[PDB]
Design an enzyme around this catalytic site. Structure first.
Site, PDB file in Angstrom:
ATOM      1  N   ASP A 160     -15.461 -59.184 -59.610  1.00 26.69           N
ATOM      2  CA  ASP A 160     -15.927 -58.455 -60.605  1.00 26.69           C
ATOM      3  C   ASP A 160     -17.423 -58.270 -60.856  1.00 26.69           C
ATOM      4  O   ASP A 160     -18.034 -58.901 -61.544  1.00 26.69           O
ATOM      5  CB  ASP A 160     -15.208 -58.525 -62.220  1.00 26.69           C
ATOM      6  CG  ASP A 160     -15.374 -57.299 -63.223  1.00 26.69           C
ATOM      7  OD1 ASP A 160     -16.345 -56.492 -62.876  1.00 26.69           O
ATOM      8  OD2 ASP A 160     -14.982 -57.286 -64.059  1.00 26.69           O
ATOM      9  N   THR A 161     -18.041 -57.449 -60.013  1.00 29.50           N
ATOM     10  CA  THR A 161     -19.653 -57.094 -59.819  1.00 29.50           C
ATOM     11  C   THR A 161     -20.263 -56.574 -61.572  1.00 29.50           C
ATOM     12  O   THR A 161     -21.298 -56.717 -61.661  1.00 29.50           O
ATOM     13  CB  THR A 161     -20.240 -56.165 -58.827  1.00 29.50           C
ATOM     14  OG1 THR A 161     -19.337 -54.799 -59.001  1.00 29.50           O
ATOM     15  CG2 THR A 161     -19.673 -56.827 -57.693  1.00 29.50           C
ATOM     16  N   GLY A 162     -19.234 -55.977 -62.206  1.00 30.47           N
ATOM     17  CA  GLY A 162     -19.409 -55.555 -63.317  1.00 30.47           C
ATOM     18  C   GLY A 162     -19.410 -56.519 -64.690  1.00 30.47           C
ATOM     19  O   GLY A 162     -19.729 -55.978 -65.581  1.00 30.47           O
TER      20      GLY A 162
HETATM   21  C1  LIG Z   1     -13.887 -49.661 -66.753  1.00 28.22           C
HETATM   22  C2  LIG Z   1     -12.522 -50.038 -66.376  1.00 28.22           C
HETATM   23  C3  LIG Z   1     -11.678 -49.148 -66.160  1.00 28.22           C
HETATM   24  O1  LIG Z   1     -11.837 -47.886 -65.618  1.00 28.22           O
HETATM   25  C4  LIG Z   1     -10.095 -49.648 -65.430  1.00 28.22           C
HETATM   26  C5  LIG Z   1      -9.839 -50.911 -65.682  1.00 28.22           C
HETATM   27  C6  LIG Z   1     -10.794 -52.104 -66.404  1.00 28.22           C
HETATM   28  C7  LIG Z   1     -12.156 -51.516 -66.686  1.00 28.22           C
HETATM   29  C8  LIG Z   1     -13.100 -52.642 -67.120  1.00 28.22           C
HETATM   30  O2  LIG Z   1     -13.227 -52.478 -68.238  1.00 28.22           O
HETATM   31  N1  LIG Z   1     -13.397 -53.738 -66.495  1.00 28.22           N
HETATM   32  C9  LIG Z   1     -14.288 -54.559 -66.771  1.00 28.22           C
HETATM   33  C10 LIG Z   1     -13.590 -56.024 -66.431  1.00 28.22           C
HETATM   34  S1  LIG Z   1     -12.307 -56.225 -67.724  1.00 28.22           S
HETATM   35  C11 LIG Z   1     -10.704 -55.696 -67.076  1.00 28.22           C
HETATM   36  C12 LIG Z   1      -9.667 -55.593 -68.166  1.00 28.22           C
HETATM   37  C13 LIG Z   1      -8.646 -54.904 -67.412  1.00 28.22           C
HETATM   38  C14 LIG Z   1      -8.413 -54.829 -66.084  1.00 28.22           C
HETATM   39  C15 LIG Z   1      -9.447 -54.898 -65.307  1.00 28.22           C
HETATM   40  C16 LIG Z   1     -10.659 -55.729 -65.611  1.00 28.22           C
HETATM   41  C17 LIG Z   1     -15.572 -54.325 -66.047  1.00 28.22           C
HETATM   42  O3  LIG Z   1     -15.237 -54.419 -64.561  1.00 28.22           O
HETATM   43  C18 LIG Z   1     -16.541 -55.094 -66.678  1.00 28.22           C
HETATM   44  N2  LIG Z   1     -17.312 -54.838 -67.873  1.00 28.22           N
HETATM   45  C19 LIG Z   1     -18.252 -53.864 -67.475  1.00 28.22           C
HETATM   46  C20 LIG Z   1     -18.899 -53.052 -68.680  1.00 28.22           C
HETATM   47  C21 LIG Z   1     -17.996 -51.927 -68.979  1.00 28.22           C
HETATM   48  C22 LIG Z   1     -18.365 -51.374 -70.491  1.00 28.22           C
HETATM   49  C23 LIG Z   1     -18.718 -52.252 -71.539  1.00 28.22           C
HETATM   50  C24 LIG Z   1     -19.793 -53.576 -71.068  1.00 28.22           C
HETATM   51  C25 LIG Z   1     -19.411 -54.186 -69.674  1.00 28.22           C
HETATM   52  C26 LIG Z   1     -18.200 -55.010 -70.212  1.00 28.22           C
HETATM   53  C27 LIG Z   1     -17.723 -55.600 -68.635  1.00 28.22           C
HETATM   54  C28 LIG Z   1     -16.839 -56.833 -69.176  1.00 28.22           C
HETATM   55  O4  LIG Z   1     -15.596 -56.445 -69.581  1.00 28.22           O
HETATM   56  N3  LIG Z   1     -17.250 -58.030 -69.118  1.00 28.22           N
HETATM   57  C29 LIG Z   1     -16.313 -59.193 -69.421  1.00 28.22           C
HETATM   58  C30 LIG Z   1     -17.378 -60.468 -68.991  1.00 28.22           C
HETATM   59  C31 LIG Z   1     -15.985 -59.339 -70.719  1.00 28.22           C
HETATM   60  C32 LIG Z   1     -15.300 -59.060 -68.317  1.00 28.22           C
END
Ligand SMILES: Cc1c(O)cccc1C(=O)N[C@@H](CSc1ccccc1)[C@H](O)CN1C[C@H]2CCCC[C@H]2C[C@H]1C(=O)NC(C)(C)C
Lengths: 99, 99
Positions: free
Chosen positions: B25-27
């Site tokens: 997860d690069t995000g």
């Molecule tokens: C944006 C998105 C979609 O369109 C579909 C599925 C998931 C997501 C999503 O929010 N993905 C996140 C991982 S958490 C995650 C949760 C469920 C499934 C997969 C990943 C991002 O990749 C990372 N995400 C990017 C970013 C999103 C906007 C809010 C601030 C950061 C928060 C960060 C994050 O959550 N960081 C943690 C350390 C808490 C994990």
């Protein structure tokens, strides 16, 4: 380009005539942009992150310039604190993870 | 390896003697694992995602095997629906984004 991960992988995008910074996000299925006006039709959608869900507007067939690559795809607009480029658009720029 | 992004970039990890699947997860700045028992000291932390925040336990200097690379780093444990490998560990396996 090759981008290492010691810092957040932020890139400049152009969308709806506006310049924005966005995070290249391999963990996101979708592309989610902060509140902005995009012209055309949209559909309500809810998306879950860590911590819960947000309501977004779903726009299809939206042109976005990501690092000089023009791509067309679905973008979601709503209350995200960071603009997120998700896998739906990452595939269109031929983006890969390598190690 | 090179990993394309047409599907979620899921990999097998070994941590605390247990096998799990996790998303590259690069995000994500940090690595966040579903509830599990890790031995040793920990500290409370809150992390924000899209949709809100969750309370986690922060464990330092934790050994994790990610695609055969052994790495040591901070792991956060709490109510995430998916195990997330964040940039803190991605750098340790020399992971890059390329297009
Ligand atoms: C944006 C998105 C979609 O369109 C579909 C599925 C998931 C997501 C999503 O929010 N993905 C996140 C991982 S958490 C995650 C949760 C469920 C499934 C997969 C990943 C991002 O990749 C990372 N995400 C990017 C970013 C999103 C906007 C809010 C601030 C950061 C928060 C960060 C994050 O959550 N960081 C943690 C350390 C808490 C994990």
């Amino acid at each position: 380009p090759q981008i290492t991960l010691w810092q957040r992988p932020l890139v400049t995008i152009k969308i709806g005539g506006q310049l924005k910074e966005a995070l290249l996000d391999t963990g996101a299925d979708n592309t989610v942009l902060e509140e902005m006006s995009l012209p055309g039709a949209w559909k309500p959608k809810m998306i879950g992150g860590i911590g819960g869900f947000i309501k977004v507007r779903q726009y299809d067939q939206i042109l976005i310039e990501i690092c000089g690559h023009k791509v067309i795809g679905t973008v979601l607009v709503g209350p995200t604190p960071v603009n997120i480029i998700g896998r739906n658009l990452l595939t269109q720029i031929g983006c890969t993870l390598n190690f």
